[PDB]
C-alpha cells in the first residue's frame, strides 16, 4: 500500500461492506459478504434483508465490532 492509486487490493488487505437499516427506530449497520457490492443493493434495505441469520431481524441488537472481545 502506502501510495496514491485507486482500487486498493493486496494480501491481508481485505475490505468489508456495511448496510444501514431503512427504519429510523433501527439505524443498525449489518455486515455483508465480500462478493456483494453496495451499488447492487436496494434503497429500502433492512435487517430482514441481511445475509447472516445471527442479525437478520430488527429486534436483534447491533454487533460489538470495536476490536476483539
Amino acid at each position: 500500500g502506502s501510495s496514491g492509486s485507486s482500487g486498493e487490493i493486496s494480501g491481508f488487505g481485505q475490505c468489508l461492506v456495511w448496510v444501514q437499516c431503512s427504519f429510523p427506530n433501527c439505524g443498525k449497520w449489518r455486515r455483508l459478504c465480500g462478493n456483494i457490492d453496495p451499488s447492487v443493493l436496494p434503497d429500502n434495505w433492512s435487517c430482514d434483508q441481511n445475509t447472516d441469520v445471527q442479525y437478520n431481524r430488527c429486534d436483534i441488537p447491533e454487533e460489538t465490532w470495536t476490536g476483539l472481545e
Binding site: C15, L16, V17, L41
Partner: peptide
Amino acid sequence: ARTKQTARKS
C-alpha cells in the same frame, strides 16, 4: 438505505 466500507482492523 445508507452504505459504507471499513478496514478489517482493531
